[PDB]
C-alpha cells in the first residue's frame, strides 16, 4: 500500500500502477495506495466558479454583517462576505471585521459596472494603466473577468497595507461621481426659499412607517390658517420642525418656559431670566405658535391687563408678510409686528443711491401709521421698525465685499477672508459712492428715532463695525446715532406732523410731551421739548432766492430759541450733543422756524442745500429747543389702567418710549481672550445702553452652533443654526461666552433696568448625526412636489436623529409644572390644528416623524439601493427581506455537478449543460465534460483539444484529470505533465525527479 523505488529509497506519489487486472493509485500527499478502479467522484464537489459565487455571498443577513439604515442598503454599504479571497489567491473564512464594499461584487447595471472598472483603473490603479476603457457596448463576460481582477487586486492591496481605510475613501469617491448618487439627481434649485438648493418633504409610507405622521400641516401662516390659500413657505433651512404636531407644540412651549426661566433653571438665579422673545421665521411655521406663546405669556404675566403689565415683557416678531400685522392685531398683539411697509419707505427714499431714491412722500403714507397728522394714541397697530438687521441689508452685502476682496465664490470664506472683506466693506461704508452699504444712514436713523407710534430698533452694525471682536471698532455713525438716541430720550414726544414741499423737502416735527396738534398750547414741560427735522434726498438741491423751508413747531413754541442737533457739511455732518456751541435759530410769533439758501445770522451750515458725502446725500438738519435742563426726560411711563380691548401692547407715548437694541452682527469674531467675549462686554456696558434709552436688549440666539458650514449661520456661528435647542453656551461656550457669561449679562442688564430678549427659533434644527431612512419627495419651499424630479415617494437617507444632551435633559421637563400652574394652557384649542397641545409625550430626541422635511443632502435619488423593478433591498427590518442576488444564497438544485443515469454532467450559471470543456473544482482538481456533456472517468488515454493542438489526457475513475505523475502499465510507463498532457520525446523534471520519455511516451530512464 506504499510504492518505493528500493534502489533510491524514494516513494512514488501521485502514481497509477497496473498489477495484473488490478490498478493501484498512490496519492499525492503520502503515496498511500488505493484501488484505482473504486475511486469515486466526490458528490459534494463544487466548481471554482461556484466557490467564487459563494465566497462573495453575505456572511449573514444580520445588522452586523451588512451596513444599513433601518434595514435599507446604500451605495456606501459594506458587508461581511462568507469568504475573503485573501491576498487575491486564497479563499479564507471571513472574520467579523473583514468588511468589503458591496460595489466590489454588485452594480446596479452594466454601464455602472463598466464605469466602476474605468474608475478603479484610473484612480484606484487596480487594473493595468494600459488597458482600454470599457464602453457602453462592453460584454458581460468581459466585465465580470475584470471585476474579479479588481477584487483580486483589492485583496492584494488590503493584504499589503493591512487596512481598508484607503478603500473606504476610494469607493466613496467613485460613488459620488454617479448622478444617481450625487446632487445631480436632486434637481438643485435656489428659487424661492430653497436657500440650500432644494427640499425633500417627508411623506407617509409603509416602507418607513416609524417616520409617519398624522400632522405635517404646512404653510399654515397668518394668511393660510384653514389651508385653503398659499401661505408663507414652510421650508426654509436644514431640518424643518413640524410645528403643526401638538406634541411638538407642547415641546415648543416647554422650550419657551426654559428660556423665560433660564436663570432660575440653570443657575438658581432669578436675575438671569429673559424678559421677552423674538419669534424667528414667523412666516415659515404654523401660526398656532403665536397664540401658544400669547397664552403662556398671558397666564404667567397677565400681559393683557394693562400697559404697565404688557410693557414689562417686550416681544417682537420676525414677520415679513404684509398681511401679518392685521392678524397679529386680531390675536391681541401678543408680540409686536414689524412695520415692513415703513422700513421699505426708508429703503426707497433714503437708503438708495442718489439716482435711485424716490420722492420722500412715501415715508408719510407707506406704513401701519399715517404720519401727516398723527395726533392720537391707542389708535394704530403697535409695531417696531428698524433700518438694518443682522440679516437685512447686512449679511448679503458683507458677503459681496468678501467675494470682491478675496475673489472666492460667494459665501465661501475663512477668518482671514472675512477680515479682508470687512476692510473693503468699511472703506465702502466710509465712501460717498457706496456699493455695499446703505446711503443716508443719519437721515434713516433720524426718521427711525423721531417717528411717533413706533418702537425703533437700533442695529449693532450701525454703531460698531459688523466684523471685529464685539464692540472693537465704531462705525462713522456711532456719534451721530448715539446723539440721536440721547436726544430722543430728552426731547422726542407728543404729536407728529410730516409733509413734503414743492421742492421735495421733508419736514418732520414732534411737538413735545403734552401737545398732540400744532395748535395745542401744551403743558409745563412741552416748552423745551419736541424736535424739528429737515430732510432732502436731492444731492443737487438748490433753493431759489426767496424760497424757504418752514418747520411748524406749533403754538407751544412761539418766539423760541432752537439749537442744532445735526447739521450737514460738505464732507460729513456736525453733531451737537447739548446746547454748547450749537448754531441757533428762532421761531416766529407763530412757532414757525424758517430756513433758506442763506445762512442764519452768519452761522455756517444753516442754509438748506444739497450735499454728497459719506453721511448725507441730500440734506439733513435736526433742531431742538435750547435751554432744556440736562436731566430732561420726555418719556412716558405705562399706565396701570385696565385695557378695554383684548391686547397686550398699545401704540401710545409709553410704548413709543421704548427702544430695542439688536446687540449683535453675524460677523462678530470668535473671542481670542475671555475679556473679548460678547456677553462679558454686554455685562460691562449695561449703563451705556441705558444712557441711549435702550429699554430692551435683543441678544443673539444663544444656542451653540452646529458648526457644520451648511449655511452662513453655521459658518459664522451666530446661534441660528444649532443641533441642541437647550445648549446655551453650556456644553462649551457659544460665540458670545459660556452660559455663566450669558447669565451675568442678563443680570447686569436687569441691574441697569433693561429687559433682555430671547431669540426663539422654532423653525428648524441642524446637523443631527443619526441617519434614518425616510420616504421623501423633492419639493419646493411650500412642499409642492417637484414635478420633474424622480424623487417622489422614494426612500432616502436623512440626518434626523439626535438633538444633544440638553434636549435630552430638559425636553418636556417643564410640562408638569406648566400644567400644575397654568392648566388653562392645556385646554386652549389652536386655529390651525383645531385642537389642544399634547404634553403626553416628551421630546427628548428628534427623529423624522417630528419634521416636515430637510434641505437636499446630495446623497442622490438612488442612494438607497433598489432592484431593477424598483423593489428596495432590506435586511427585513422595515420591509421584506431582499438582498442583491450576489449577496444571497442560491438554490443549487440542478446546478453544478449533477449525476444523471450513469453519467455526471455540469450545469453552468444558466442551468445549461456544459459540453467539451474542462472545469476545475474548488480544491484544484480538473474535470472534463465531453462533447455529449458527460464527465470522462474511464482511466484511458484520450485525445482532447483544449484549443490547439490535440493533447493526450487520462481521467481517473473519480473523473479527476491525472497530472504531474507516472502511469506504469504492463506495456510501459508514461508521464503526464502539469496540464495533464502526456509528454513525448523529451526530458522533463518534476521536483527531484528527471524523466526521459521516448517518441511513444514510454519512460526510457528516470533519476
Ligand X SMILES: OC[C@H]1O[C@H](O[C@H]2[C@H](O)[C@@H](O)[C@@H](O)O[C@@H]2CO)[C@H](O)[C@@H](O)[C@@H]1O
849-888 residues near Ca ion, rule: CB under 5 A = none
Question: What does 157-218 look like in DSSP terms, one character per residue?
Answer: HHHHHS-SHHHHHHHHHHHTTSGGGSGGGTT---STT-TTS-EEEE---STTGGG--S----
Was 242 annotated as part of a binding site? Answer: no
Residue placing its CB nearer to Ca ion in the complex, 244 or 366: 244
**Binding ligand X by CB under 6 A: which of 190, 230, 410, 586?**
230
- Does 846 bind ligand X (CB under 6 A)? Our answer is no
Q: Tell me whether residue 571 is annotated as binding.
A: no
Which of 787, 869, 893, 970 forms a contact with ligand X (CB under 6 A)? 787
Out of 185, 284, 429, 878, the only residue in the binding site for Ca ion (CB under 5 A) is 284
252: contact with Ca ion by CB under 5 A: no
Q: Does 358 bind ligand X (CB under 6 A)?
A: no
- Which of Ca ion, ligand X, none does residue 956 bind to, with CB < 5 to 8 Å depending on kind? none
Measured from the CB atom, the residue of 321 and 972 that comes closer to ligand X is 321
240 or 676: whose CB is closer to Ca ion?
240
Does 792 contact ligand X by CB under 6 A? no
> Quick one: 628 or 857, whose CB is closer to Ca ion?
857
Q: Does residue 61 bind ligand X (CB under 6 A)?
A: no
Extract the C-alpha cell encoding 882: 431582499
Q: Quick one: CA torsion of 213, 218, 223, 227, rounded to 10 degrees?
A: -60
Does 229 help bind ligand X (rule: CB under 6 A)?
Answer: no
Instruction: Find out whether 484 and 475 touch, Cβ atoms under 8 Å.
Output: no
Q: Which is nearer to ligand X, 397 or 799 (CB)?
A: 397
Q: CA 29 to CA 2: how far, in whole Å?
A: 12
> In this chain, which of 50, 57, 98, 234 binds Ca ion, going by CB under 5 A?
234
Q: What grid cell was written down for 306?
A: 394693562
Give whole-number Cα distances, 603 to 148, 531, 563, 573, 581, in Å.
94, 20, 12, 15, 11
State the nearest-atom distance from the C-beta of 761 to Ca ion, in Å: 11
CB under 8 Å to 783, separation ≥6 — which residues? 199, 201, 218, 219, 234, 235, 852, 853
What backbone phi and psi angles, to 5 degrees, belong to 691?
Answer: -70, -20
Q: By C-beta, is 83 or 284 nearer to Ca ion?
A: 284
Block residue for cell numbers 453655521: 714
**912 contacts: CB under 8 Å, gap ≥ 6:** none
What is the nearest approach in angstroms of ligand X to the Cβ of residue 391? 4
Residue nearest to ligand X (CB): 232
**Chosen residue from 3, 52, 320, 670 binding ligand X by CB under 6 A:** 320
The secondary structure of residue 712, as a DSSP letter, is: G
Residue 486 and residue 494 in contact, taking contact as beta carbons nearer than 8 Å:
no
Task: Report the residue number, 785 or 922, with the smaller CB distance to ligand X.
Answer: 785
186: contact with ligand X by CB under 6 A: no
State the number of binding residues for ligand X (CB under 6 A).
27
Over its C-alpha atoms, the chain yields an Rg (Å, rounded) of: 42
Q: Is 277 in the site for ligand X (CB under 6 A)?
A: no
Q: Tell me: does residue 232 bind ligand X (CB under 6 A).
A: yes
Q: Is 662 annotated as a binding residue?
A: no
DSSP assignment string, 614-682? SS-EEEEEEEEETT--TT-----PPP-PPPSSS-S---SHHHHT--EEE---TTBPPPSSGGG-HHHHH
Q: Is 234 annotated as a binding residue?
A: yes
240 binds, among Ca ion, ligand X, none (CB under 5 to 8 A by kind): Ca ion
User: Which of ligand X, Ca ion, none does 234 bind, CB closer than 5 to 8 A by kind?
Assistant: Ca ion
Considering only 321, 354, 572, 831, the residue that binds ligand X (CB under 6 A) is 321
CA-based nearest residue to 966, from 38, 10, 42, 21: 10
Determine, following the binding rule CB under 6 A, whether residue 367 of this chain makes contact with ligand X: yes
Which residue from 155, 240, 724, 741 is in contact with Ca ion, where contact means CB under 5 A? 240
Q: How far is the CB of 192 from ligand X (least distance, A)?
A: 5
Q: Which is nearer to Ca ion, 497 or 706 (CB)?
A: 706
Q: Does 154 bind ligand X (CB under 6 A)?
A: no
Among candidates 555, 543, 562, which has minimal Cα distance to 622? 562
User: Of the ranges 283-291, 656-664, 738-746, 750-758, which one interacts with Ca ion (CB under 5 A)?
Assistant: 283-291
d(CA 686, CA 703): 22
Question: Nearer Cβ to ligand X, position 356 or 542?
Answer: 356
Strand partners, 463: none
Contact by Cβ (8 Å): 754, 697:
yes
Query: Which stretches of the chain bind ligand X, using CB under 6 A?
Result: 191-193, 230, 232-233, 236, 281, 283-284, 320-322, 341, 365-370, 391-392, 780, 784, 786-788
Detail the residues annotated as belonging to a binding site. 234, 240, 284, 763
Amino acid at each position: 500500500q506504499y510504492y518505493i523505488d528500493p534502489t533510491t529509497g524514494q516513494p512514488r506519489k501521485n502514481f497509477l500502477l497496473q498489477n495484473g487486472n488490478d490498478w493501484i493509485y498512490f496519492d499525492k500527499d503520502t503515496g498511500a495506495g488505493t484501488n484505482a478502479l473504486k475511486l469515486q467522484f466526490d458528490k459534494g464537489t463544487i466548481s471554482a466558479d461556484e466557490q467564487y459565487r459563494r465566497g462573495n455571498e453575505a456572511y449573514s443577513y444580520d445588522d452586523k454583517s451588512i451596513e444599513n439604515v433601518n434595514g435599507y442598503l446604500t451605495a456606501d454599504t459594506w458587508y461581511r462576505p462568507k469568504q475573503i479571497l485573501k491576498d487575491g489567491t486564497t479563499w479564507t473564512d471571513s472574520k467579523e471585521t473583514d468588511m468589503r464594499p458591496i460595489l466590489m461584487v454588485w452594480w446596479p447595471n452594466t454601464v455602472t459596472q463598466a464605469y466602476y472598472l474605468n474608475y478603479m483603473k484610473q484612480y484606484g490603479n487596480l487594473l493595468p494603466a494600459s488597458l482600454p476603457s470599457f464602453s457602453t457596448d462592453a460584454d458581460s463576460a468581459e466585465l465580470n473577468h475584470y471585476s474579479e481582477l479588481v477584487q483580486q487586486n483589492i485583496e492584494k492591496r488590503i493584504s499589503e497595507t493591512g487596512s481598508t481605510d484607503w478603500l473606504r475613501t476610494l469607493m466613496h469617491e467613485f460613488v459620488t461621481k454617479n448622478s444617481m448618487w450625487n446632487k445631480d439627481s436632486e434637481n438643485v434649485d435656489y428659487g424661492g426659499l430653497q436657500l440650500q438648493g432644494g427640499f425633500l418633504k417627508y411623506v407617509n409610507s409603509d416602507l418607513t412607517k416609524y417616520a409617519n405622521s398624522d400632522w405635517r400641516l404646512m404653510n399654515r401662516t397668518a394668511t393660510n390658517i384653514d389651508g385653503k390659500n398659499y401661505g408663507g413657505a414652510e421650508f426654509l433651512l436644514a431640518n424643518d420642525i413640524d410645528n403643526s404636531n401638538p406634541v411638538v407644540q407642547a415641546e415648543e412651549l416647554n422650550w419657551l418656559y426654559y428660556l423665560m426661566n433660564f436663570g432660575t433653571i440653570t443657575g438658581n438665579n432669578p436675575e438671569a431670566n429673559f424678559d421677552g422673545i423674538r419669534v424667528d421665521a414667523v412666516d415659515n411655521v404654523d401660526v398656532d405658535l403665536l397664540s401658544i406663546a400669547r397664552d403662556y405669556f398671558n397666564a404667567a404675566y397677565n400681559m393683557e391687563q394693562s400697559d404697565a403689565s404688557a410693557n414689562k415683557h417686550i416681544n417682537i416678531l420676525e414677520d415679513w408678510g404684509w398681511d401679518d400685522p392685521a392678524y397679529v392685531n386680531k390675536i391681541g398683539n401678543p408680540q409686536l409686528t414689524m412695520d415692513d411697509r415703513l422700513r421699505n419707505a426708508i429703503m426707497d427714499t433714503l437708503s438708495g443711491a442718489p439716482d435711485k431714491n424716490q420722492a420722500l412722500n412715501k415715508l408719510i403714507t407707506q406704513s401701519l401709521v399715517n404720519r401727516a397728522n398723527d395726533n392720537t394714541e391707542n389708535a394704530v397697530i403697535p409695531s417696531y421698525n428698524f433700518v438694518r438687521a443682522h440679516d437685512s441689508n447686512a449679511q448679503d452685502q458683507i458677503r459681496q465685499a468678501i467675494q470682491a476682496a478675496t475673489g472666492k465664490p460667494y459665501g465661501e470664506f475663512n477668518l482671514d477672508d472675512e477680515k479682508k472683506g470687512m476692510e473693503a466693506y468699511i472703506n465702502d461704508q466710509n465712501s460717498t459712492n457706496k456699493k455695499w452699504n446703505l446711503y443716508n444712514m443719519p437721515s434713516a436713523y433720524t426718521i427711525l428715532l423721531t417717528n411717533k407710534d413706533s418702537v425703533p430698533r437700533v442695529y449693532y452694525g450701525d454703531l460698531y463695525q459688523d466684523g471685529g471682536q464685539y464692540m472693537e471698532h465704531k462705525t462713522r455713525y456711532f456719534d451721530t446715532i448715539t446723539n440721536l438716541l440721547k436726544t430722543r430720550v430728552k426731547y422726542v414726544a407728543g404729536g407728529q406732523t410730516m409733509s413734503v414741499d414743492k421742492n421735495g423737502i421733508l419736514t418732520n416735527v414732534r411737538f413735545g410731551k403734552g401737545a398732540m396738534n400744532a395748535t395745542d398750547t401744551g403743558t409745563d414741560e412741552t416748552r423745551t421739548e419736541g424736535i424739528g427735522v429737515v430732510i432732502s434726498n436731492n444731492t443737487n438741491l438748490k433753493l431759489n432766492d426767496g424760497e424757504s423751508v418752514v418747520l411748524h413747531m406749533g403754538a407751544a413754541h412761539k418766539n423760541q430759541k432752537y439749537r442744532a442737533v445735526i447739521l450737514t457739511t460738505e464732507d460729513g455732518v456736525k453733531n451737537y450733543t447739548n446746547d454748547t456751541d450749537a448754531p441757533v435759530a428762532y421761531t416766529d410769533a407763530n412757532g414757525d422756524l424758517h430756513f433758506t439758501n442763506t445762512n442764519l445770522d452768519g452761522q455756517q451750515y444753516t442754509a438748506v442745500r444739497g450735499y454728497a458725502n459719506p453721511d448725507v446725500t441730500g440734506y439733513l438738519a435736526v433742531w431742538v429747543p435750547a435751554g432744556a435742563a440736562d436731566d430732561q426726560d420726555a418719556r412716558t411711563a405705562p399706565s396701570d389702567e385696565a385695557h378695554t380691548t383684548k391686547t397686550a401692547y398699545r401704540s401710545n407715548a409709553a410704548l413709543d418710549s421704548n427702544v430695542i437694541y439688536e446687540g449683535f452682527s453675524n460677523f462678530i469674531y470668535w473671542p481670542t481672550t475671555e475679556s473679548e467675549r460678547t456677553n462679558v462686554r454686554i455685562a460691562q456696558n449695561a449703563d451705556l445702553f441705558k444712557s441711549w434709552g435702550i429699554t430692551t436688549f435683543e441678544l443673539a440666539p444663544q444656542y451653540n452652533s452646529s458648526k457644520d458650514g451648511t449655511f452662513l449661520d453655521s459658518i459664522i456661528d451666530n446661534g441660528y443654526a444649532f443641533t441642541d435647542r437647550y445648549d446655551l453656551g453650556m456644553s462649551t461656550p457659544n460665540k458670545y461666552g459660556s452660559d455663566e457669561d450669558l447669565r451675568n449679562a442678563l443680570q447686569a442688564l436687569h441691574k441697569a433696568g433693561l429687559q433682555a430678549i430671547a431669540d426663539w427659533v422654532p423653525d428648524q434644527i441642524y446637523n443631527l448625526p443619526g441617519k434614518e431612512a425616510v420616504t421623501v419627495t423633492r419639493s419646493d419651499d411650500h412642499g409642492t412636489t417637484w414635478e420633474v424630479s424622480p424623487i417622489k415617494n422614494v426612500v432616502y437617507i436623512t440626518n434626523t436623529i439626535g438633538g444633544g444632551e440638553y434636549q435630552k435633559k430638559y425636553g418636556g421637563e417643564f410640562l408638569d409644572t406648566l400644567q400644575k400652574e397654568y392648566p388653562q394652557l392645556f385646554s386652549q384649542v389652536y386655529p390651525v390644528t383645531q385642537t389642544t397641545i399634547d404634553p403626553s409625550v416628551k421630546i427628548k430626541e428628534w427623529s423624522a416623524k417630528y419634521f416636515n422635511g430637510t434641505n437636499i443632502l446630495h446623497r442622490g435619488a438612488g442612494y438607497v439601493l433598489r432592484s431593477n423593478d424598483g423593489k428596495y433591498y432590506n435586511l427585513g427590518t422595515s420591509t421584506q427581506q431582499f438582498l442583491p442576488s450576489q449577496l444571497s444564497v442560491q438554490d443549487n438544485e440542478g446546478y453544478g455537478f449533477v449525476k444523471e443515469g450513469n453519467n455526471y454532467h455540469y450545469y453552468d450559471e444558466n442551468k445549461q449543460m456544459v459540453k467539451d470543456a474542462f472545469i476545475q473544482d474548488s480544491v484544484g482538481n480538473w474535470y472534463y465534460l465531453d462533447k455529449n456533456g458527460n464527465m470522462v472517468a474511464n482511466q484511458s488515454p484520450v485525445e482532447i483539444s483544449s484549443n490547439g493542438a490535440s493533447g493526450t489526457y487520462l481521467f481517473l475513475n473519480n473523473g479527476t484529470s491525472f497530472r504531474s505523475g507516472l502511469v506504469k502499465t504492463d506495456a510501459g510507463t508514461y508521464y503526464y505533465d502539469g496540464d495533464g498532457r502526456m509528454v513525448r520525446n523529451q526530458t522533463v523534471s518534476d521536483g527531484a525527479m528527471t524523466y526521459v520519455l521516448d517518441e511513444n511516451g514510454k519512460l526510457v530512464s528516470e533519476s
